Amino acid sequence: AEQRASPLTSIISAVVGILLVVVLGVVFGILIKRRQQKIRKYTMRRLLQETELVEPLG
Amino acid sequence: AEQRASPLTSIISAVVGILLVVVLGVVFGILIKRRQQKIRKYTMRRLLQETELVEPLG
């Protein structure tokens, strides 16, 4: 019938969904671990890029 | 003549790729803005003087 019934398309949509949730889950946990009694001062490291705002070319 | 030649499959793979990169971008931006509003803002204010170390004269 007209009913699609695409198996692959169904898997691709399912895979991605979990993929996005996985990638993040890893990033979130990573930050926490590096946060739990771990001062990396990442703020300053990223702040060095702020100078670009007050560092024109001419 | 061609191996696959699947237009949809090509779009699904392209969409996801950008999708994952998009979601993250939003998460990263949020955190930053969530840190800039930290009670330790004073740190940054004083950090602006650090540039003097990497700001030599002609």
PDB file of C-alpha atoms in Angstrom:
ATOM      1  CA  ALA A   1       0.000   0.000   0.000  1.00  0.00           C
ATOM      2  CA  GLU A   2       0.942   3.674   0.272  1.00  0.00           C
ATOM      3  CA  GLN A   3       2.249   3.042   3.787  1.00  0.00           C
ATOM      4  CA  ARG A   4       5.978   3.781   3.666  1.00  0.00           C
ATOM      5  CA  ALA A   5       7.244   1.079   6.025  1.00  0.00           C
ATOM      6  CA  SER A   6      10.883   2.137   5.694  1.00  0.00           C
ATOM      7  CA  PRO A   7      13.046   0.136   8.135  1.00  0.00           C
ATOM      8  CA  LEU A   8      16.281   2.024   7.471  1.00  0.00           C
ATOM      9  CA  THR A   9      14.685   5.459   7.804  1.00  0.00           C
ATOM     10  CA  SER A  10      13.263   4.255  11.120  1.00  0.00           C
ATOM     11  CA  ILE A  11      16.703   3.219  12.366  1.00  0.00           C
ATOM     12  CA  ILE A  12      18.429   6.399  11.200  1.00  0.00           C
ATOM     13  CA  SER A  13      15.973   8.508  13.199  1.00  0.00           C
ATOM     14  CA  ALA A  14      16.386   6.310  16.276  1.00  0.00           C
ATOM     15  CA  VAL A  15      20.184   6.246  16.075  1.00  0.00           C
ATOM     16  CA  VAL A  16      20.537  10.022  15.787  1.00  0.00           C
ATOM     17  CA  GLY A  17      18.208  10.661  18.710  1.00  0.00           C
ATOM     18  CA  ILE A  18      20.329   8.532  21.028  1.00  0.00           C
ATOM     19  CA  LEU A  19      23.509   9.857  19.418  1.00  0.00           C
ATOM     20  CA  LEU A  20      22.734  13.462  20.351  1.00  0.00           C
ATOM     21  CA  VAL A  21      21.780  12.409  23.879  1.00  0.00           C
ATOM     22  CA  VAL A  22      25.017  10.429  24.114  1.00  0.00           C
ATOM     23  CA  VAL A  23      27.432  13.103  22.898  1.00  0.00           C
ATOM     24  CA  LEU A  24      26.002  15.572  25.413  1.00  0.00           C
ATOM     25  CA  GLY A  25      25.904  13.097  28.284  1.00  0.00           C
ATOM     26  CA  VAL A  26      29.657  12.707  27.861  1.00  0.00           C
ATOM     27  CA  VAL A  27      30.297  16.451  27.691  1.00  0.00           C
ATOM     28  CA  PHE A  28      28.139  17.150  30.743  1.00  0.00           C
ATOM     29  CA  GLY A  29      29.810  14.507  32.888  1.00  0.00           C
ATOM     30  CA  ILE A  30      33.252  15.637  31.758  1.00  0.00           C
ATOM     31  CA  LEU A  31      32.689  19.186  33.005  1.00  0.00           C
ATOM     32  CA  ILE A  32      31.350  17.938  36.339  1.00  0.00           C
ATOM     33  CA  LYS A  33      34.358  15.673  36.866  1.00  0.00           C
ATOM     34  CA  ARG A  34      36.759  18.512  36.063  1.00  0.00           C
ATOM     35  CA  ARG A  35      34.694  20.644  38.443  1.00  0.00           C
ATOM     36  CA  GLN A  36      34.550  18.333  41.462  1.00  0.00           C
ATOM     37  CA  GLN A  37      37.459  19.709  43.489  1.00  0.00           C
ATOM     38  CA  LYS A  38      39.346  20.687  40.335  1.00  0.00           C
ATOM     39  CA  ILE A  39      40.012  24.370  39.657  1.00  0.00           C
ATOM     40  CA  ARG A  40      41.219  24.552  36.056  1.00  0.00           C
ATOM     41  CA  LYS A  41      40.471  28.274  35.815  1.00  0.00           C
ATOM     42  CA  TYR A  42      39.125  27.602  32.320  1.00  0.00           C
ATOM     43  CA  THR A  43      37.374  30.964  32.637  1.00  0.00           C
ATOM     44  CA  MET A  44      40.638  32.903  32.421  1.00  0.00           C
ATOM     45  CA  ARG A  45      41.901  30.726  29.569  1.00  0.00           C
ATOM     46  CA  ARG A  46      38.778  31.644  27.602  1.00  0.00           C
ATOM     47  CA  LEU A  47      38.938  35.247  28.815  1.00  0.00           C
ATOM     48  CA  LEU A  48      42.183  35.695  26.882  1.00  0.00           C
ATOM     49  CA  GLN A  49      39.997  35.737  23.770  1.00  0.00           C
ATOM     50  CA  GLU A  50      38.079  38.725  25.134  1.00  0.00           C
ATOM     51  CA  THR A  51      41.064  40.950  24.351  1.00  0.00           C
ATOM     52  CA  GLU A  52      39.997  40.645  20.712  1.00  0.00           C
ATOM     53  CA  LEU A  53      37.210  43.070  21.616  1.00  0.00           C
ATOM     54  CA  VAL A  54      39.740  45.683  22.732  1.00  0.00           C
ATOM     55  CA  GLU A  55      42.438  44.717  20.234  1.00  0.00           C
ATOM     56  CA  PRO A  56      41.509  46.354  16.900  1.00  0.00           C
ATOM     57  CA  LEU A  57      43.701  46.395  13.791  1.00  0.00           C
ATOM     58  CA  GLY A  58      43.260  50.011  12.742  1.00  0.00           C
TER      59      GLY A  58
ATOM     60  CA  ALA B   1      25.244   2.494 -12.793  1.00  0.00           C
ATOM     61  CA  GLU B   2      25.841   4.130  -9.413  1.00  0.00           C
ATOM     62  CA  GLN B   3      26.427   2.399  -6.077  1.00  0.00           C
ATOM     63  CA  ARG B   4      23.749   4.050  -3.940  1.00  0.00           C
ATOM     64  CA  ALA B   5      22.647   7.419  -5.321  1.00  0.00           C
ATOM     65  CA  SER B   6      20.281   7.941  -2.388  1.00  0.00           C
ATOM     66  CA  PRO B   7      19.281  11.622  -2.071  1.00  0.00           C
ATOM     67  CA  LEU B   8      17.334  11.235   1.175  1.00  0.00           C
ATOM     68  CA  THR B   9      20.054   9.231   2.922  1.00  0.00           C
ATOM     69  CA  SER B  10      22.454  11.995   1.889  1.00  0.00           C
ATOM     70  CA  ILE B  11      20.263  14.676   3.462  1.00  0.00           C
ATOM     71  CA  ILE B  12      19.633  12.730   6.667  1.00  0.00           C
ATOM     72  CA  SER B  13      23.374  12.377   7.261  1.00  0.00           C
ATOM     73  CA  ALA B  14      23.950  16.061   6.512  1.00  0.00           C
ATOM     74  CA  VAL B  15      21.101  17.253   8.733  1.00  0.00           C
ATOM     75  CA  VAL B  16      22.184  15.210  11.752  1.00  0.00           C
ATOM     76  CA  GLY B  17      25.781  16.381  11.501  1.00  0.00           C
ATOM     77  CA  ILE B  18      24.744  20.029  11.656  1.00  0.00           C
ATOM     78  CA  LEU B  19      22.059  19.211  14.224  1.00  0.00           C
ATOM     79  CA  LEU B  20      24.563  17.846  16.742  1.00  0.00           C
ATOM     80  CA  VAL B  21      26.866  20.814  16.139  1.00  0.00           C
ATOM     81  CA  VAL B  22      23.908  23.147  16.665  1.00  0.00           C
ATOM     82  CA  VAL B  23      22.623  21.721  19.948  1.00  0.00           C
ATOM     83  CA  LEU B  24      26.119  21.934  21.430  1.00  0.00           C
ATOM     84  CA  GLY B  25      26.636  25.515  20.297  1.00  0.00           C
ATOM     85  CA  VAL B  26      23.583  26.469  22.343  1.00  0.00           C
ATOM     86  CA  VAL B  27      24.830  24.610  25.419  1.00  0.00           C
ATOM     87  CA  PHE B  28      28.321  26.104  25.188  1.00  0.00           C
ATOM     88  CA  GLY B  29      27.042  29.647  24.760  1.00  0.00           C
ATOM     89  CA  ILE B  30      24.723  29.294  27.743  1.00  0.00           C
ATOM     90  CA  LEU B  31      27.452  28.127  30.122  1.00  0.00           C
ATOM     91  CA  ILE B  32      29.724  31.012  29.134  1.00  0.00           C
ATOM     92  CA  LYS B  33      27.015  33.607  29.765  1.00  0.00           C
ATOM     93  CA  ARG B  34      26.288  31.725  32.990  1.00  0.00           C
ATOM     94  CA  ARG B  35      29.902  32.149  34.104  1.00  0.00           C
ATOM     95  CA  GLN B  36      30.399  35.785  33.105  1.00  0.00           C
ATOM     96  CA  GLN B  37      27.672  36.575  35.636  1.00  0.00           C
ATOM     97  CA  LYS B  38      29.620  34.925  38.455  1.00  0.00           C
ATOM     98  CA  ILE B  39      30.113  36.636  41.814  1.00  0.00           C
ATOM     99  CA  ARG B  40      33.839  36.371  41.100  1.00  0.00           C
ATOM    100  CA  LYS B  41      33.479  38.923  38.302  1.00  0.00           C
ATOM    101  CA  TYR B  42      36.200  40.905  40.071  1.00  0.00           C
ATOM    102  CA  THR B  43      38.680  38.276  38.890  1.00  0.00           C
ATOM    103  CA  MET B  44      38.084  39.153  35.237  1.00  0.00           C
ATOM    104  CA  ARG B  45      38.240  42.883  35.960  1.00  0.00           C
ATOM    105  CA  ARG B  46      41.716  42.366  37.414  1.00  0.00           C
ATOM    106  CA  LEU B  47      42.614  39.881  34.675  1.00  0.00           C
ATOM    107  CA  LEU B  48      42.394  42.697  32.126  1.00  0.00           C
ATOM    108  CA  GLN B  49      45.707  43.884  33.566  1.00  0.00           C
ATOM    109  CA  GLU B  50      47.308  40.548  32.683  1.00  0.00           C
ATOM    110  CA  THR B  51      47.315  41.561  29.018  1.00  0.00           C
ATOM    111  CA  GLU B  52      50.189  43.876  29.936  1.00  0.00           C
ATOM    112  CA  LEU B  53      52.318  40.725  30.060  1.00  0.00           C
ATOM    113  CA  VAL B  54      51.497  39.941  26.430  1.00  0.00           C
ATOM    114  CA  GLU B  55      51.218  43.560  25.295  1.00  0.00           C
ATOM    115  CA  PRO B  56      54.776  44.634  24.381  1.00  0.00           C
ATOM    116  CA  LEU B  57      55.718  47.941  22.754  1.00  0.00           C
ATOM    117  CA  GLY B  58      56.652  48.432  19.112  1.00  0.00           C
TER     118      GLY B  58
END
